[PDB]
Each structure stands twice: as C-alpha cells, then as structure tokens.
Design a protein around this ligand. Sequence first.
Ligand SMILES: *[C@@H]1O[C@H](CO)[C@@H](O[C@@H]2O[C@H](CO)[C@@H](O[C@@H]3O[C@H](CO[C@H]4O[C@H](CO)[C@@H](O)[C@H](O)[C@@H]4O)[C@@H](O)[C@H](O[C@H]4O[C@H](CO)[C@@H](O)[C@H](O)[C@@H]4O[C@H]4O[C@H](CO)[C@@H](O)[C@H](O)[C@@H]4O)[C@@H]3O)[C@H](O)[C@H]2NC(C)=O)[C@H](O)[C@H]1NC(C)=O
Ligand SMILES: *[C@@H]1O[C@H](CO)[C@@H](O)[C@H](O[C@@H]2O[C@H](CO)[C@@H](O[C@@H]3O[C@H](CO[C@H]4O[C@H](CO)[C@@H](O)[C@H](O)[C@@H]4O)[C@@H](O)[C@H](O[C@H]4O[C@H](CO)[C@@H](O)[C@H](O)[C@@H]4O)[C@@H]3O)[C@H](O)[C@H]2NC(C)=O)[C@H]1NC(C)=O
Ligand SMILES: *[C@@H]1O[C@H](CO)[C@@H](O)[C@H](O[C@@H]2O[C@H](CO)[C@@H](O[C@@H]3O[C@H](CO)[C@@H](O)[C@H](O)[C@@H]3O)[C@H](O)[C@H]2NC(C)=O)[C@H]1NC(C)=O
Ligand SMILES: *[C@H]1O[C@H](CO)[C@@H](O)[C@H](O)[C@H]1O
Ligand SMILES: *[C@H]1O[C@H](CO)[C@@H](O)[C@H](O)[C@H]1O
Ligand SMILES: *[C@H]1O[C@H](CO)[C@@H](O)[C@H](O)[C@H]1O
Lengths: 366, 366, 366
Amino acid sequence: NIGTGDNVLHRAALCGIIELAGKRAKLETALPNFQNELNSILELNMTAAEPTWLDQFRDKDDRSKPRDLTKQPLPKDTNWADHWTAWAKAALPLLNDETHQAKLKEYKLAGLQPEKLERARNTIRRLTAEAVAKAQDPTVAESTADLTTEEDLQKQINQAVYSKDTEPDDDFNGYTAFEGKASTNRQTICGSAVAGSKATNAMDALFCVCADDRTNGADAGKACVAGTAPGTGWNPGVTATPTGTMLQKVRKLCNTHGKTTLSAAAIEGRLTAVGNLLTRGSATSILGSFLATDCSGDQGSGMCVAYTEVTDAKGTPTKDIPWMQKLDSVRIKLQKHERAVEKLGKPQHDLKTILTLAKDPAYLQL
Amino acid sequence: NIGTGDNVLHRAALCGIIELAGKRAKLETALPNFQNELNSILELNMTAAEPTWLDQFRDKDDRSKPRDLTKQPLPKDTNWADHWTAWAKAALPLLNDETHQAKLKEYKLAGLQPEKLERARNTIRRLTAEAVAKAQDPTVAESTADLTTEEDLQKQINQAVYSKDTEPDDDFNGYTAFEGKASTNRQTICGSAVAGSKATNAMDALFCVCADDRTNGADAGKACVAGTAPGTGWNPGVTATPTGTMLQKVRKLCNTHGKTTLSAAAIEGRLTAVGNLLTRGSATSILGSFLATDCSGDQGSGMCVAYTEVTDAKGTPTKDIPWMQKLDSVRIKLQKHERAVEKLGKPQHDLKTILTLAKDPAYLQL
Amino acid sequence: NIGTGDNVLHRAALCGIIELAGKRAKLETALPNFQNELNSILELNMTAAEPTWLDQFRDKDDRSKPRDLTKQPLPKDTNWADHWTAWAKAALPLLNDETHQAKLKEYKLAGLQPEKLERARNTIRRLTAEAVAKAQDPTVAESTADLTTEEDLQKQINQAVYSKDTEPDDDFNGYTAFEGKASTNRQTICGSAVAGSKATNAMDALFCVCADDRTNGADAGKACVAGTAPGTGWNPGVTATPTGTMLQKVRKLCNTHGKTTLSAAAIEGRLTAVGNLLTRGSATSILGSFLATDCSGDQGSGMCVAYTEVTDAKGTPTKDIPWMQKLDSVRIKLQKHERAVEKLGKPQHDLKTILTLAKDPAYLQL
Ligand SMILES: *[C@@H]1O[C@H](CO)[C@@H](O[C@@H]2O[C@H](CO)[C@@H](O[C@@H]3O[C@H](CO[C@H]4O[C@H](CO)[C@@H](O)[C@H](O)[C@@H]4O)[C@@H](O)[C@H](O[C@H]4O[C@H](CO)[C@@H](O)[C@H](O)[C@@H]4O[C@H]4O[C@H](CO)[C@@H](O)[C@H](O)[C@@H]4O)[C@@H]3O)[C@H](O)[C@H]2NC(C)=O)[C@H](O)[C@H]1NC(C)=O
Ligand SMILES: *[C@@H]1O[C@H](CO)[C@@H](O)[C@H](O[C@@H]2O[C@H](CO)[C@@H](O[C@@H]3O[C@H](CO[C@H]4O[C@H](CO)[C@@H](O)[C@H](O)[C@@H]4O)[C@@H](O)[C@H](O[C@H]4O[C@H](CO)[C@@H](O)[C@H](O)[C@@H]4O)[C@@H]3O)[C@H](O)[C@H]2NC(C)=O)[C@H]1NC(C)=O
Ligand SMILES: *[C@@H]1O[C@H](CO)[C@@H](O)[C@H](O[C@@H]2O[C@H](CO)[C@@H](O[C@@H]3O[C@H](CO)[C@@H](O)[C@H](O)[C@@H]3O)[C@H](O)[C@H]2NC(C)=O)[C@H]1NC(C)=O
Ligand SMILES: *[C@H]1O[C@H](CO)[C@@H](O)[C@H](O)[C@H]1O
Ligand SMILES: *[C@H]1O[C@H](CO)[C@@H](O)[C@H](O)[C@H]1O
Ligand SMILES: *[C@H]1O[C@H](CO)[C@@H](O)[C@H](O)[C@H]1O
C-alpha cells in the first residue's frame, strides 16, 4: 500500500518545475548591442567629410536646418535616397558649427595639414564601409528577431505552472484550482486508468500527487512528506475545490526561495524528468504511485494524476500535454536566443575595433 | 516483495535510451561551406588582374586554349607552381574573351579609368589575400574526417539498443532476443548475484527489467506498469526466447512516438541515469529491484538484469558494458563533429562580407 | 518499513557527487591562446623595427643587457612609459644579434632592400595596431579573467565531498568522519525531524544514508544495496565515529573508476538531483527514506540525513547547505569559463590570420 515517502521521486520532478515559476528564472546574459558604436562611427564619417558634403545636408535657406526633402529633392542616379535618413541622423548635430568643431577635437582629427586629413578621411570612409557591411549582414536582424526577454519567459513559465502571468501569493489570491471544474471526488478530479484529470497546469498536478485528504491523512496522504502530513484538510467529497491554504501547504514542499539561471538544457532536463515518469497505459498515462483502478488518494489505489494525451500507443509529453508543451516552448526560445546572442557578438567585437582604430590618429596616418 | 510500480525508476532510465533508437535521433547541425564565396573571390582577383597575367594561363597557340605545363614549363625562378591549379580553375572561364567582359561588367569592374581600375585591382588583391588567409587554417581534412552523418550515428544507436542497424518493426520481425542464447529459466537469462545475463543490448535489458511472465503476472510482473501488466505470457522454462509479440508489449512503455535532438550532453545524461542505478556488488551489478538471489521475476527474488563487467571493485559502465560503450561512442563522435563545425565555418562569415566589399564599386575606389 | 533497496534513488543522486571527486572531473575544453598570439605579433613588430628603435631598449653598458629605467630614465616627453613593459617583453629575446637575425629569417624579413623593408614594416605596424585594438575590447579582458583551471575545480569538488583538497585513500587516512563530532547514537549523528546532522560534507551524508549498522543489517541496512549489506559493523552506541574501513564499504557503491566531463550543466543537474530530493519539513529537511522520528537506521524510523538550513519555509540548498554551496561555486566558475572560451574564439582566430598574413611577403608589399 502507498505510504510515507512513496512519492518523493514524483515530488522532486514536479518541484523542479514549480521552482522555475515566479520571478525566480533569470536570463543572465549580455544583450549584444553595437548600435551606439555604429551610430558613432557614422557620425565620425560625417564629421570628417568635406564641408561640401555636409552642405548637401544643410537647408539651402538656413544653414543650421535639416534639408527639407520637399524643398530640395534628390537627383536621379544619386542613390542618396534611403541613405539620407541615416546620413541626416549623423548630420543633424553637425549642422551646427560649434558642435562640428567639438566633434572634430573629440575624435582627435582637428588641426592637421590637408594631406593628413585627406589621408585620415580616406581610411575612415573605408572603415565606415566595413562597419556598415557587417552591421547590415542579413544574419543580423535574423538573430535580432530570435532575441527574447526575461519577462516574456517568466510569463510563459507562470502560465505553464499556474495558467497565470504571475505566481499567486501564499493565499493563491486570484487563483482557483483545476480551472474551477472539480466535481465529485478525488478520482474524478485527478483521473483514473480510463479518464483524464481536471488539472491543466503543473501546480494542480502537484496537488493531485501530493495533497493529503481527510481519508488518507494517516497513510497515503504522507506520500510526498517525511514525518508530518501536509495537513490540507481537503475533503473533496464535500467541497471539491481546494482552498488557497491547502494549495500552499503543498507548494511549500518546493524550493520557492531561490533562483535558477535560465538555460535551455536546464528546462530540457526538468521536462525530461517529468515526462519519463509517466506510466503509459491503455487509455491514460499516470504520474505518481498507482496500485489499482484510479487516483483516488486511497492507499490501495493511487496518489497520482492521469493524462489522456499520452498512452502506450501515442503521445510525446512535451508536445501533447499542454502545460509541458508551453514549457518546451520556453526551451525553444532560449535556444534561439542563446544562438542569437552568440552570433551578434562577432560584429559587436568588429565594430568596437573599428571605432577604436578610427579614433587613433596614428593608425590613420600610416 | 516486488510489486506494482517498483521499477518506474529503471523503466524511465532504460526508456530514455530506447527513445533514441529508430530514426528518432536527429543531427540538426548545419554542415558549413564557404567554397562558393571563396571561389567567387578568386575569380574576381583574376578578372581584375592585368591581361598579361590572364595571358599567362593560355597556350602560346590558340588564345582560348589553356597552357600545357608539359608544353610550356613553369618558370623555376617563381613560386607559380603551387598556386597554378587554383589560378587556372578560376581563370578557365576567363580564357574565353567574351566571358571576361561579361564577368568584368558583372563585377562592376568593366568600365573606364585605367587608373581607377588599378585602384580596384589593388583592393581586390588585398581582399583576396586576406580571404585565403582567413580560410587557410591547416588543421582541415582531418577536421573534415572528424565529421559524421546522422545516418551513421543512428546505426550505432540501433546497434546499442537492438544489435541491428535498424529498429525492428512492431512485430520485431527478424529480431531474436538475447542473441538467441536464452535457455533454462528467467534467472539464467537475466542473471543473478554471481552471474550475468544473456542480454547484450539495451532492449533485452529492458525486457529483463520489465517483462511479466506466466508466474508473476499478478505481483512482480507489474513492476514497470500502473493499471494492467504487460501481458507477455512469457514462459522461459517451456520456451526461453520470447517472441516479438511479447517484446513489443514491453517496448510500448517507452516513447517511440517523438524525436530527440542529438547532443553529447543528451547522451551523457541518459547514460548516467542508467549507470548510477546499477547497484554494485562483489560479483555483479544489478539494474532493477532486487531482494534475494537472482533476477528470476519472483516477487521475493528480483525483476532485474545483471552484469559482471562492473562491480564494487572494478569497471565504469560507459567503457565496460558493451552496449553502453557503443552509445558512448556516439557521444564521442558527436563532440568531435561539433568541434569541427566551429573550426570549419569561421571563415564563412568573414568570406561573405569580403565579397560584398569587393562587389562594392565605391569600396574599390578609395 | 525501510527495507532492501529503498534508498537506491538517494544513493544514485549522492553517487553522482562522489564520482566527481578525486582527479576524475576533467576540463576537456581547449585552453585559449589569445595573449600568446598577441605576444607573437608584438615580437614580429619589434624585429621589423629599425635598429635604432631596438637600441632604445638596451643600456649603454653591454648591448646584451636590458636598459635599466632608473639608470636611463625614459624621456618625459614621450608616451613610452605607457608601452614599455610590453615593448620590453618583445625586445629582450631580440637583443642578441643571432636571435634577431634568426627571427628576421623566420618572419621572411631578412635580406630585404631598404624600400621593401620599409614597405613591409609599415604594413606590419598596421596589422600590429589592429591586433592591439582587438585586445582592448573589455569583453576580451573580462573573458581572460573568467578562465579557470582543472586543478582549481578539482580541489573545490574534493572540498565539497571530503572537506579536503585530495580524495582520501581506501583507508581514509588523514580523514575523520563527521569532523570528529559524532556522539551518542545514530539519530544524533544523522539528524532527526527536529535536529540537523553532524555531516558537513557529501561523503558523510552518503554514509548516514547508506551505511548499515549492527542492528539493521538484515532490514534497513540494505536500503542502498541488493543482496548483501555493506557490512560496516558500525555501532554508534559504543564507538560513534566510523572507521575508514567502514566509510570505504559505502564509497565502493559509487563509480570511482571512470571520469566525468566537467560542464556547468553537468554540475547543475547533479546538484538539482540532490537538492529536490530533500523532503522539506517545519524544522529540518530529510534526504533518504523516513518513516517516523529520526534517522536512526531503525527500519521503522529512517535511513536518512537531516539538514536544518533548508525547511518548508526557508532555504535553498545550493546557497545554504555549505557543501552544496561549494559545489555550486564550481558550476558558476564553469559558467563564466564556458562563456569566456566562446567569446575568445573569433579574436584568437582573427589574431592567427594576422600572424600568417604578416608572414606572407607578397601581402606585405602590396
Ligand atoms: C611596433 O613598432 C613600432 C616601431 O617600428 C612602434 O612605433 C613606436 O610608436 C611609439 C608610440 O606608440 C613612438 O613613440 C613616439 O616617440 C616620439 C619620439 O620621441 C623621441 O624623440 C623626441 C623628439 O622628437 C625626443 O624628445 C624623445 O626624447 C625621444 O628620443 C615621441 O615624440 C612621441 O611622443 C609624443 O607624442 C605622444 C603621443 O603620441 C605624447 O604622449 C608625447 O608627450 C609626445 O608629445 C610630443 O609631441 C606633441 C605633439 O603631438 C607635443 O604637444 C608635446 O609637447 C611633445 O613634444 C612618441 O612617444 C615611437 O617613436 C615608435 N617607434 C618608432 C617609429 O621607431 C610601435 O609602438 C610598435 N607597436 C606596438 C603596438 O608596440
Ligand atoms: C591575384 O592576382 C594578382 C595579379 O594581378 C596577384 O596578387 C596574384 O597572382 C600572382 O601571385 C603570385 C604569388 O606571389 C605572384 O608570384 C610571384 O611572381 C614574381 C614575378 O614573376 C616572375 O616573372 C618573370 C617570369 O619568370 C620573371 O622574369 C621575373 O623575374 C619574376 O620572377 C616572382 O618573382 C615570385 O617568385 C618568388 O617566389 C618567392 C617569393 O618570395 C621566392 O622564392 C622568390 O622571391 C621568387 O622570386 C612569385 O612567383 C605573381 O607575381 C602574381 N601575379 C602578378 C601578375 O603579380 C593573384 N593571387 C591569387 C592567389 O589569386
Ligand atoms: C561617409 O562619408 C564619405 C564622404 O566623405 C563617403 O564615404 C560617404 O558619403 C557618400 O557616400 C555615397 C555612397 O554611399 C556617395 O553617393 C554616391 O553619389 C553618386 C552621384 O554623385 C552616385 O552615382 C553613387 O551611386 C552614390 O550614391 C556620396 O558621393 C558620398 N559623399 C561624398 C563623396 O561626399 C559616407 N559613407 C557612409 C557609409 O555613410
Ligand atoms: C482505488 O483502489 C482501492 C483498492 O482496490 C479501492 O479501495 C478504492 O475504492 C479505489 O479508489
Ligand atoms: C529468488 O529468491 C526468492 C526468495 O528467496 C526465491 O523464492 C526464488 O525462487 C528465487 O528465484
Ligand atoms: C525511529 O522510529 C521507530 C518507530 O517509531 C522507533 O522504534 C525508533 O526508536 C526510532 O528511532
């Protein structure tokens, strides 16, 4: 008969899921950003150009004024179109003369014989082209699209665990177990060899596997604990829906006091842990200790939860069990993100080196 | 005594191996090539060279004829020997005096200004020399030798699981369990505290751990299931070698319905799960619930499989249990395949940007 | 009642730690070589410098001697104090004329006409300027600072397992169990529901969980094994501290005969396996089978170990159980080291191409 500690293995696997919820999942990565460097290189290119070129960006009416594209349109073969928005962004601070003087000495390029400036201007244009050729590689924006945020991943984890965007408090305010569809008795709520459960998320599955009730409190109700039962007082025959005080007495079995560095292989190992413990039967798969008939909490029956999406003839948990599929989505986004962050580090290092050399007057006069 | 659900741990470990078999293991890595981009750069260098240099790769007779090295030997005062094959290969279309002009304009290099051509040629030159340097990296071919195919890996996995190159069908057609060595009774087949099993692959080990028979169907035969026993009807004392019908009744407990991305970490975890469940003794190591004397399937004996290659005094499974060593070989070959990928595509991104710059007419004119 | 094999799950998780100890944990990742490439480009740049420049790094008394800065202070009208230490590292070998002539030959610079030498020198100084700027990326300096060694992590793992820098021999010489604080009986040594154990490391936690004593050898003392009990002969009511012979009879249950590839994900998984197996109560957390009151080894009580640092209301094992926090440091170091190796890949490959380019005479003369 199912007694004390007989569900420690299933509790450990499920708690590996519950501990990821809340704000406890951390991305802990460096968003690669080379836009400031690029915008500065482009400013250096415009700062070092000939005034004739910058005068193409002034307004014919007023000097320190953006060229009104409606007033002075662009030529035909000019190809200046579409590059104007990037150029004007670099030219807008330099339309003022005082700033242009300031940027000249900031970039350490003011006060040189024309030949020296000619030499520096040529390399900077070449350098600026190399920086643009990398920043505009179609691999970028591809990787940038595959970037996620810590908050988007946290919301998905809390949806897979609680079906909410945030982890409920210790009273589970704004939370109702089993979507409010618990009905008759624990076997109807938690499932059987012929029927699925009413638990759609991870937390309610954990309650089906670990909660004690008024009947098993001295035997099967200690399957996830050691010396003292959870003491939920759950009486599903009378009141089916567990109250928040009961849910918290089961969640406290899981580590809700730490943090986890979000890795894709970390999610994979936790989902694999849960999925491999499902025992595949003719009509359902069972997670937890099961002896006979159903998941009623009876010490001769089972302390478990049942799913109809996975059987000994079909089903992959991370694809067909909804809450597991949601967490597998988080793993997939973590993968795309980790590959994107890595791929965007190469142009970031290149553009930093371009900017560093462009501000070395010695390297420019070689 | 051994009862329902007592081998869920071992079933999860062994099914983590089984699900890797068939064609379910995917090598989703991208085999890199940059030969496309490199060859185009080399053509550009020759398309931009002096016609005296293109005339070097022609026969002294017909202009469209290539130079016969036997007819015209190479100048021994020059290094023109080693690089002659790559030069001609790129030049071979350019020997045609019409393809040259087409390519000359196709690379935005046909035009005017013999001075501005020489400018372009000089930059194409440097870009080419840097491109061949970025890809020259000696340690190649041996790195391409440390490359495998998804098919070769899957054949090794199936050899670890089934001793075959392909997974048997749902009738185990063409499959003989235990290498056709089963005899006497279940303990002789599956081992004991003093002797090993006849099972040399993973599937047959899972059968020893999880099969019910004609005696334990109401007790220990339910060790890996929840509701109903597998139902093999195995009777080794009458017929030792089980049928495919019986074998499939156990394999249906594992997930044969999905896929698994092949990573060396994925193989390592699954091998450690099985390896650390081996209970090390003086003469054998036992996988599965063991109580008394042998792995006979009796509820007072054991539902297990025994190995003599690792004990409490010797042996590491990933090197001394043949089927685990074969699966570890997939892990070693995959960590080499991964390591060679990075060291064969690092030029790929650098070569691609060089082509964009070499095809930019402005970049040629600095 | 606690019987044969009831602690296999706990043995496998704790043996996942013990097997990391000794010199079995391996840092198989390639060790970066970034500074060595940079140091080589610096030495090449010095060989190519004018003899007047190299003469600035010798004192006036014996050319073979390095210039003493106190004897010949650097010109306060130069930035030479900013580059002297690196400059001197490159000059010192070349101070000897043979070593200089040999380097000029190795780098294909010896026997060069003045114009060709100056042309090559200028290109080498441009490549050298690019290599230095690349090393100035803060991510490069951070990555080299985040690189670990295998020996450092091996000492840390052994400190988590044995509280020692080296794994004790098969008689545990120099090792005293429970830091010499065992007393009274097994329940005070291994803990209870109200009190923590005297086990500060992982090896003594494995002993509490798996050691038979002179009273449970036929029942609970087989919780970690199959047929034959460990046979320690432990009698904590007479002599509390177990002898090294007893400790080894438990350690022989783990695989100490192989190796483990070190990785942050591999350490995280092994820690999680132990951390979530801890059954969290109001006053202690228990690892192992538990039925009644304490971890006394009695079949009606428990084969377990107790911690007071984690409860159902507080604590994360990897931060609050000291030996687990030690092992978690290894993971964090492996995290930064793995990111550092990845970030140093492209710049080290980029410096390598600079070295081969600076050793191609054709490229230097373009
Ligand atoms: C690869 O190898 C090359 C050599 O092949 C090597 O190049 C060397 O680069 C360094 C700089 O990194 C050069 O150092 C310069 O040296 C000159 C000359 O100093 C001598 O001559 C002066 C008189 O002209 C004497 O007074 C003096 O005693 C020395 O004998 C210095 O003049 C340079 O310093 C000036 O500029 C610095 C900034 O760049 C200032 O910090 C410094 O205060 C000096 O300022 C002077 O000029 C200012 C105007 O700009 C003026 O305002 C000040 O009042 C002041 O007068 C500088 O130290 C060295 O010459 C190069 N070696 C050569 C060409 O042979 C590379 O370093 C090497 N690569 C790497 C990475 O190691
Ligand atoms: C890309 O195209 C451009 C051409 O526009 C080039 O960059 C390159 O083609 C060729 O690259 C090779 C590799 O360096 C160059 O070879 C060198 O040619 C030198 C001159 O050739 C000889 O010409 C006549 C015929 O014999 C002779 O009278 C001359 O005296 C002269 O020797 C040649 O001197 C040199 O040989 C040297 O080889 C080693 C170099 O250190 C030493 O053993 C020794 O110094 C020896 O002298 C070498 O063979 C070639 O010039 C160049 N083509 C042109 C037109 O410049 C293309 N690159 C790629 C890979 O696509
Ligand atoms: C950086 O600044 C320098 C100028 O000092 C240039 O390298 C470049 O400014 C302009 O670059 C564009 C091309 O990107 C040139 O436009 C060309 O105009 C031609 C007609 O006159 C047309 O036929 C071509 O197709 C181009 O569109 C423009 O001349 C040039 N400005 C000059 C030379 O003053 C800047 N580059 C970047 C990356 O911002
Ligand atoms: C679960 O199975 C037990 C034993 O057959 C039964 O008593 C319960 O009623 C059932 O829910
Ligand atoms: C396994 O051990 C049990 C108990 O001793 C015995 O009854 C069986 O015959 C044996 O195979
Ligand atoms: C552990 O619990 C059992 C059963 O109550 C008791 O007999 C032992 O004395 C205790 O250590």
